[PDB]
mmCIF file of C-alpha atoms and ligand atoms in Angstrom:
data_model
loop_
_atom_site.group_PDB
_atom_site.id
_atom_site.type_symbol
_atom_site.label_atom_id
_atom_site.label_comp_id
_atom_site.label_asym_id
_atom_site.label_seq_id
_atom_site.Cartn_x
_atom_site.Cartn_y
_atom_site.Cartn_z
ATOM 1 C CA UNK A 1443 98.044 96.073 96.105
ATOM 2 C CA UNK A 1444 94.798 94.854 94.422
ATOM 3 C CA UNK A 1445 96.948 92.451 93.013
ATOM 4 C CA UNK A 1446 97.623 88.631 93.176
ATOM 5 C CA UNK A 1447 100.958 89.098 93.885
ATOM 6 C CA UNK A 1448 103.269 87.422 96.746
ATOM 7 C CA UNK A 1449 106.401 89.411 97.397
ATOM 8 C CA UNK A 1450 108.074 86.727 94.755
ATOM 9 C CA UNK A 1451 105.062 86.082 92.033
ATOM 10 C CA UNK A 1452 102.510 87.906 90.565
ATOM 11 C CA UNK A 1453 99.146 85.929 88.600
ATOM 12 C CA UNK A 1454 98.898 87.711 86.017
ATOM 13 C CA UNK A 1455 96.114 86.326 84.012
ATOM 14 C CA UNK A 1456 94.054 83.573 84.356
ATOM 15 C CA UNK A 1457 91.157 81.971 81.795
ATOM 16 C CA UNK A 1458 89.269 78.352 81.389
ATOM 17 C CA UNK A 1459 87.877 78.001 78.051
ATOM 18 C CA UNK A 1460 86.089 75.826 75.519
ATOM 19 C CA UNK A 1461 86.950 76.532 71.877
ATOM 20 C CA UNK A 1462 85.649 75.133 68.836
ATOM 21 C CA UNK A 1463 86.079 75.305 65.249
ATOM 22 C CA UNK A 1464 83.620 76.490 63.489
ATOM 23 C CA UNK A 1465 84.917 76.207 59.807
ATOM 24 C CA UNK A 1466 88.973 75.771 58.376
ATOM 25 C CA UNK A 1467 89.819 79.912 58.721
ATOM 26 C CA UNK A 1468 87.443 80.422 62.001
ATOM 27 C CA UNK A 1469 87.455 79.770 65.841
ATOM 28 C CA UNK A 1470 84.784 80.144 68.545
ATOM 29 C CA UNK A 1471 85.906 80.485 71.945
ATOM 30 C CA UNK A 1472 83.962 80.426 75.320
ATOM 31 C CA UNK A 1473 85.824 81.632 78.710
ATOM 32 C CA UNK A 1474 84.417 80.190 81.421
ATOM 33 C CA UNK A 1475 85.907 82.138 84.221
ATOM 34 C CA UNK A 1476 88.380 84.471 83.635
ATOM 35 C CA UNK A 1477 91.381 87.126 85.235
ATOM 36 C CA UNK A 1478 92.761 89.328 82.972
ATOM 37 C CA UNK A 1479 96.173 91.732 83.764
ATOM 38 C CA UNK A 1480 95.215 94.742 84.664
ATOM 39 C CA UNK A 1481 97.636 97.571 86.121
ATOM 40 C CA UNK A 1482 97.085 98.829 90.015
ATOM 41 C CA UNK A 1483 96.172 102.012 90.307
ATOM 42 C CA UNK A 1484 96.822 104.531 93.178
ATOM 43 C CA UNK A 1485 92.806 105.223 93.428
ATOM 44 C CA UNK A 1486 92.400 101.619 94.191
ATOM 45 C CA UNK A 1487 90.870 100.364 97.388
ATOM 46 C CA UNK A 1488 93.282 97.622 99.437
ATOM 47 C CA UNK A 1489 91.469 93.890 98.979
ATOM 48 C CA UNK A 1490 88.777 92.972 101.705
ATOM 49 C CA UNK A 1491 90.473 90.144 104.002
ATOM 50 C CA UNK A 1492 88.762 86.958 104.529
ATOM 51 C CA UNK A 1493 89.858 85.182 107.281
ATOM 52 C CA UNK A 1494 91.844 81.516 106.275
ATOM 53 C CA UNK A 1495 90.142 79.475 108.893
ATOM 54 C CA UNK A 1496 86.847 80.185 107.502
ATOM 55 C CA UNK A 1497 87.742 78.152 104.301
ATOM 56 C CA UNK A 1498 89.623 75.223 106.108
ATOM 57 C CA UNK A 1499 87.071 73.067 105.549
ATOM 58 C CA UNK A 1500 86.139 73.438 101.838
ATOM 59 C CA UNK A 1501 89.753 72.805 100.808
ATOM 60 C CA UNK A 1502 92.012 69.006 102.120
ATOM 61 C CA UNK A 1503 93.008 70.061 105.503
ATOM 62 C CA UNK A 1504 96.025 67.350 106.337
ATOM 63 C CA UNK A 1505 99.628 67.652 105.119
ATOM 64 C CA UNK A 1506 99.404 69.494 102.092
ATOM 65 C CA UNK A 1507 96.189 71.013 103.540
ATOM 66 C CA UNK A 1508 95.693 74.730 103.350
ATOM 67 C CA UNK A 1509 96.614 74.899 107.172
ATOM 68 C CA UNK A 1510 99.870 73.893 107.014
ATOM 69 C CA UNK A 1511 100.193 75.642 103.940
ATOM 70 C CA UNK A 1512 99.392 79.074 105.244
ATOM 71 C CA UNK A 1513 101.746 77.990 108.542
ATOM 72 C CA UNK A 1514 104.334 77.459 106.207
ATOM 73 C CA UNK A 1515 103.897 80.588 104.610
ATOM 74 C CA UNK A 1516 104.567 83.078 103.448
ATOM 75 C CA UNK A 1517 100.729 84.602 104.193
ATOM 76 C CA UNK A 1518 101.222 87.466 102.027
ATOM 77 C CA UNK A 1519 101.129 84.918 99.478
ATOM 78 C CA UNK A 1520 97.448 83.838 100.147
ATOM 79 C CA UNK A 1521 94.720 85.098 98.387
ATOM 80 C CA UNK A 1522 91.193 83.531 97.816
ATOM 81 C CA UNK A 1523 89.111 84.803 94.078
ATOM 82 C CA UNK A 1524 85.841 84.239 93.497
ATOM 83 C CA UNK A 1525 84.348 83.131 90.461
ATOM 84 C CA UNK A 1526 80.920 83.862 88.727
ATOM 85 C CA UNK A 1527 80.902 81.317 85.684
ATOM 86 C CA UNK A 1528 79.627 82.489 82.334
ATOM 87 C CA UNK A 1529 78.112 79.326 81.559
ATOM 88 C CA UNK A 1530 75.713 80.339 78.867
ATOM 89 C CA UNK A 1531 78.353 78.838 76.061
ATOM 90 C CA UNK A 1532 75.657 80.054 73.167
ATOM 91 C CA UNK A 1533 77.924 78.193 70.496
ATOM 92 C CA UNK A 1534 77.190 74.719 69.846
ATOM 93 C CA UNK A 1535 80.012 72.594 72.054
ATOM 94 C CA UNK A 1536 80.417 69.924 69.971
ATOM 95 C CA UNK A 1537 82.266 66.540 69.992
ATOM 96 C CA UNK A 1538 85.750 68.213 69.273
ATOM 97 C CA UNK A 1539 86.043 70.854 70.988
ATOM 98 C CA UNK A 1540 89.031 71.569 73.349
ATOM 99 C CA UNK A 1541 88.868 72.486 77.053
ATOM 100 C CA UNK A 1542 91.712 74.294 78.557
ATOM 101 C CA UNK A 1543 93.288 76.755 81.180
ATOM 102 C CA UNK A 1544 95.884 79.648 80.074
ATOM 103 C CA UNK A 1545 97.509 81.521 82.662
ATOM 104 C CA UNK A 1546 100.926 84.295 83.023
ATOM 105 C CA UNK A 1547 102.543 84.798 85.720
ATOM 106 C CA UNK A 1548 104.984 87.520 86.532
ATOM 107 C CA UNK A 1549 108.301 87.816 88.359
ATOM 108 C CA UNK A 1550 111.468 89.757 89.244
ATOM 109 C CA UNK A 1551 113.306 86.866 89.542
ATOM 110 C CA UNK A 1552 113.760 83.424 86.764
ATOM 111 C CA UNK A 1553 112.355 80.861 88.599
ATOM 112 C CA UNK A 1554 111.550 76.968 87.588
ATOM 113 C CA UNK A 1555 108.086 77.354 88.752
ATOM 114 C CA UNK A 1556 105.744 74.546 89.578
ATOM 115 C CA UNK A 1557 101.776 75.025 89.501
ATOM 116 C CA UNK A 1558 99.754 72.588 91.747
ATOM 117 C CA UNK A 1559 96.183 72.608 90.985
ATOM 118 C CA UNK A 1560 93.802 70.911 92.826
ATOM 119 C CA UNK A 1561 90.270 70.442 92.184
ATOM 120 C CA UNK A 1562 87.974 69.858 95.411
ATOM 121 C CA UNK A 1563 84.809 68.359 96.476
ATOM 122 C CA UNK A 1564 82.913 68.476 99.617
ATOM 123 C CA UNK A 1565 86.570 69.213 100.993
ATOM 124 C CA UNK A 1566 88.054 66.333 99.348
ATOM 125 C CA UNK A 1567 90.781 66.094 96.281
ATOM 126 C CA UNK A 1568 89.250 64.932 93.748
ATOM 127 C CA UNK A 1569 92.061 65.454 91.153
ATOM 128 C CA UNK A 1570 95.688 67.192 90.923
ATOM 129 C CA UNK A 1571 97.178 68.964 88.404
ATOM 130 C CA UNK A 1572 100.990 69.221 88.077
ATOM 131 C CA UNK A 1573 102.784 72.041 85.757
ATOM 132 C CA UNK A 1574 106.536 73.009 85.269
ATOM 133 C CA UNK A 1575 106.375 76.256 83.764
ATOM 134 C CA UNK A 1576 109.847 78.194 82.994
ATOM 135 C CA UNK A 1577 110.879 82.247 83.285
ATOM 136 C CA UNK A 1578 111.059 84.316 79.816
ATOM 137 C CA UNK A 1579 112.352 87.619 80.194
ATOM 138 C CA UNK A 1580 110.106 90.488 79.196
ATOM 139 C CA UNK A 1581 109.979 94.050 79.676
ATOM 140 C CA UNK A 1582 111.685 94.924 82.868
ATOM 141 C CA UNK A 1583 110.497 91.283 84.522
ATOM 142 C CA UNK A 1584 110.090 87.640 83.938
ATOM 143 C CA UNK A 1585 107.041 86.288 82.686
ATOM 144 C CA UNK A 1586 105.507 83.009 83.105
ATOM 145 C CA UNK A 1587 102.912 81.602 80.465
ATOM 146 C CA UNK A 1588 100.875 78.246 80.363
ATOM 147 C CA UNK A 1589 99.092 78.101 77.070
ATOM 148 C CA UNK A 1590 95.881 75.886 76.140
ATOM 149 C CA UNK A 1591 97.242 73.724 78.865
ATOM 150 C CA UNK A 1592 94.545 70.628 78.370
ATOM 151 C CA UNK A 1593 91.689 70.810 81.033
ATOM 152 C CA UNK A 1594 91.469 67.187 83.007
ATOM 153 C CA UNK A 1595 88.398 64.763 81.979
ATOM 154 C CA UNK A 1596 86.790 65.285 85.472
ATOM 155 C CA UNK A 1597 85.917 69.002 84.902
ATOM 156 C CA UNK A 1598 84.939 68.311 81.076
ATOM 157 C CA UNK A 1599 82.210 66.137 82.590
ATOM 158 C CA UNK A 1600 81.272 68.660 85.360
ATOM 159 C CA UNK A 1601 81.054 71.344 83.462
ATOM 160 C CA UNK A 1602 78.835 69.825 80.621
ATOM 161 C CA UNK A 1603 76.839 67.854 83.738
ATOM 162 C CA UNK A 1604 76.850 71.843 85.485
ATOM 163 C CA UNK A 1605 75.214 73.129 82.320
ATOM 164 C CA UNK A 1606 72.712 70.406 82.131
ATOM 165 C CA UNK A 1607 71.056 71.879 85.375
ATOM 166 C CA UNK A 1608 67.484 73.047 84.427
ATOM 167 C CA UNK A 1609 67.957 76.384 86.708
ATOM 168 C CA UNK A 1610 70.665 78.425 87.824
ATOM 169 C CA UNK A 1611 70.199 78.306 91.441
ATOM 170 C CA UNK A 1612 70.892 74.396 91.129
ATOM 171 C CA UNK A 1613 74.440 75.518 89.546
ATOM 172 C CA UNK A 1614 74.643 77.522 92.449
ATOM 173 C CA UNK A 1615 73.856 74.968 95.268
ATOM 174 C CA UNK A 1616 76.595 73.015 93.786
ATOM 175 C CA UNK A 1617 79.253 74.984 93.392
ATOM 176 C CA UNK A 1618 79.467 75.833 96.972
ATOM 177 C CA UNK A 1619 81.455 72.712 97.763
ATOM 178 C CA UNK A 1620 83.219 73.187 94.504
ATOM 179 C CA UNK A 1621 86.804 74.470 94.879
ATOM 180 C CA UNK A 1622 90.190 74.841 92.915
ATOM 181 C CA UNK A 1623 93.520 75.090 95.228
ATOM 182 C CA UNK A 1624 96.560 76.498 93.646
ATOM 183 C CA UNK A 1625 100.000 76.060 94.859
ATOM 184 C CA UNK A 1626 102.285 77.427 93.027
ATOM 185 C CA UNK A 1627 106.098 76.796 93.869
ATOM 186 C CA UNK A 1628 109.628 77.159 92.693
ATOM 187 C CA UNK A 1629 110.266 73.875 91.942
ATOM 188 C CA UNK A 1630 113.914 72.637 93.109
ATOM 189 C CA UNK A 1631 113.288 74.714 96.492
ATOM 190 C CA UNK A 1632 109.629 74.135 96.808
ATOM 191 C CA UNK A 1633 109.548 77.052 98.903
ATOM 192 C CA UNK A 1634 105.935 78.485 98.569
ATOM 193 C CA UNK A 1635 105.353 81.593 95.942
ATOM 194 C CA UNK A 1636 101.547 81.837 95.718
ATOM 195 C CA UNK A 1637 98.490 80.219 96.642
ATOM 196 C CA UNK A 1638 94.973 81.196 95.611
ATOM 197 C CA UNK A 1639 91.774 79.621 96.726
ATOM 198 C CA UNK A 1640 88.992 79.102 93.923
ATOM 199 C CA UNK A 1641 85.260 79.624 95.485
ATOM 200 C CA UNK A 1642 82.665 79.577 92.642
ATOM 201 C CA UNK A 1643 79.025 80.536 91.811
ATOM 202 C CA UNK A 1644 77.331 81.585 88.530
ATOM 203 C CA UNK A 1645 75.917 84.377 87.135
ATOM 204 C CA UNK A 1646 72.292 84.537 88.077
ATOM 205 C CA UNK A 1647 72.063 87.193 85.339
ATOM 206 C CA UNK A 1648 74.500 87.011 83.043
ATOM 207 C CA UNK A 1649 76.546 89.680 82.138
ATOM 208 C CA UNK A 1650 79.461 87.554 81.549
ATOM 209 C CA UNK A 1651 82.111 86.238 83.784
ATOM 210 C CA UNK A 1652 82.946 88.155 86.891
ATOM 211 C CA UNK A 1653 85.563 88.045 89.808
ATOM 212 C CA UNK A 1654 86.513 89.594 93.215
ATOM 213 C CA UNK A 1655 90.016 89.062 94.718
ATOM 214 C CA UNK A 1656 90.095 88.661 98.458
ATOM 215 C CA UNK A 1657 93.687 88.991 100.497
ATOM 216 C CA UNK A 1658 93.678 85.774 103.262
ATOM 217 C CA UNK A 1659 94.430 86.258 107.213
ATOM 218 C CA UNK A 1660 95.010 85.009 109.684
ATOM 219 C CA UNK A 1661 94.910 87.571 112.709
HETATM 220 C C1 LIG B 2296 93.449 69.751 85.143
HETATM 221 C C2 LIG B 2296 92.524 70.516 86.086
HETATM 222 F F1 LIG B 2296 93.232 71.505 86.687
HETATM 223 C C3 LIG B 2296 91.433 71.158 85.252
HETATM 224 O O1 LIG B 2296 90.859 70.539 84.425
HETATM 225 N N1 LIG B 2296 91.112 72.557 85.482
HETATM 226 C C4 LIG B 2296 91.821 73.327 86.496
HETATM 227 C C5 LIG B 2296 91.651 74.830 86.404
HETATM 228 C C6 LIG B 2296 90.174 75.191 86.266
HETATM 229 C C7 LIG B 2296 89.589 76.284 86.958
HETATM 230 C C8 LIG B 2296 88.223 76.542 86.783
HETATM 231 C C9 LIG B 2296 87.467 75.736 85.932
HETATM 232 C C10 LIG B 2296 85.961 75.986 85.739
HETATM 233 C C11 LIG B 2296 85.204 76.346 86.837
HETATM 234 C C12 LIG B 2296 83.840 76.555 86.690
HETATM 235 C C13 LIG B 2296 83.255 76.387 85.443
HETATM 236 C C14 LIG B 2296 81.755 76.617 85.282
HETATM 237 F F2 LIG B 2296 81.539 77.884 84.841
HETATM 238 F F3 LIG B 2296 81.261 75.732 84.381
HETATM 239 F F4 LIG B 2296 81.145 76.432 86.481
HETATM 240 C C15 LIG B 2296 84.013 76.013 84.347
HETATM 241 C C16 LIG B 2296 85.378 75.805 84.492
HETATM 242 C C17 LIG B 2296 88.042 74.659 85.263
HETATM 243 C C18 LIG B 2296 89.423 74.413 85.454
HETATM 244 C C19 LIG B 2296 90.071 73.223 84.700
#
C-alpha cells in the first residue's frame, strides 16, 4: 500500500551514513541514501510494478539467486527502491569517521529476524552481510531496529573511490551495475519475509537524497 511491507514485515526506515566528530559536544552526519517511515495515506497512488525478470541479471541468479527467490516466494514480498545518492558529503570525511547502515523494521508478530545483504557487481556477489536482529514490542506492533550497524570495508572504498569521479555522469555509468539484495528472513524457519532490490544513481542536481519504491511481478 505504498509501503515496503510483505504480509509478515514492514521496512520501516532505512539510512547509510558517514558521521564524524567535529569537536567533544558535536557530531556531523552525512546520509547517503535514505528511507524514512512515513504513514500510507488513502490519497496515495498503488506502486508502479516492474517486472522481476527484467532485473535477473543485475542481481546472482543461481541458488540463492533472485529467481528462485521470487519462486519461493512469497511475491508480495518483493519490492525493488531506487536510490539517488547525495554524495556531495560537504563536511570534511576524515580519517575517523564511521560508516554505517540503520534500519527498523515493523511487525505484528515477534520474530528472530535475519537480514541478508548482499552487495553486487556486474551481477556478481561481491560481499554478504549477515544480521540477527530481535522483536521489541511497541505501540500496537513489534519493531525491529539495527543501529550504526558498521558498513563493510568494500563500500568504504567505493564510496570514497565513487566520490573521487571528476563528473557526475561517471557516478552514474557506474552505478548501473551496482546493486544491494536484501533478504530478510525469520531465522529458525528461514521462510522468506521481505526482499528489496537496491538499483542506484546520483543526483545530477542535488537536492539531496531521493527514492521511488517499485512493487515486483511477475505476470
Ligand atoms: C556490510 C554491507 F552491507 C555494507 O557495507 N552496506 C550495505 C547497505 C548499504 C546500502 C547502500 C549503500 C550506499 C550506496 C550508495 C552510496 C553512494 F551514494 F555513495 F553512491 C553510498 C552508500 C551502502 C551500504 C553499506
Amino acid at each position: 500500500d505504498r509501503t515496503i511491507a510483505s504480509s509478515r514485515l514492514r521496512l520501516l526506515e532505512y539510512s547509510a551514513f558517514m558521521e564524524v566528530q567535529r569537536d567533544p559536544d558535536t557530531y556531523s552526519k552525512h546520509l547517503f541514501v535514505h528511507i524514512g517511515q512515513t504513514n500510507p495515506a488513502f490519497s496515495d497512488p498503488p506502486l508502479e510494478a516492474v517486472d522481476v525478470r527484467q532485473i535477473y541479471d543485475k542481481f546472482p541468479e543461481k541458488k540463492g539467486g533472485l529467481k528462485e527467490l521470487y519462486e519461493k516466494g512469497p511475491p508480495n514480498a518483493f519490492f525493488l527502491v531506487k536510490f539517488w545518492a547525495d554524495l556531495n558529503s560537504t563536511i570534511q570525511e576524515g580519517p575517523g569517521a564511521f560508516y554505517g547502515v540503520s534500519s527498523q523494521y515493523s511487525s505484528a508478530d515477534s520474530m528472530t529476524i535475519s537480514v541478508s545483504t548482499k552487495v553486487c557487481s556486474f551481477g556478481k556477489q561481491v560481499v554478504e552481510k549477515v544480521e540477527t536482529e530481535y522483536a521489541r514490542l511497541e505501540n500496537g506492533r513489534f519493531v525491529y531496529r539495527i543501529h550504526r550497524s558498521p558498513m563493510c570495508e568494500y563500500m568504504i572504498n567505493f564510496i570514497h573511490k565513487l566520490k573521487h569521479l571528476p563528473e557526475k555522469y561517471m557516478m552514474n555509468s557506474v552505478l548501473e551495475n551496482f546493486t544491494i539484495l536484501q533478504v530478510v528472513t525469520s531465522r529458525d524457519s528461514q521462510e522468506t519475509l521481505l526482499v528489496i532490490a537496491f538499483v542506484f544513481e546520483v543526483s545530477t542536481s542535488e537536492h539531496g537524497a531521493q527514492h521511488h519504491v517499485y512493487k515486483l511481478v511477475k505476470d
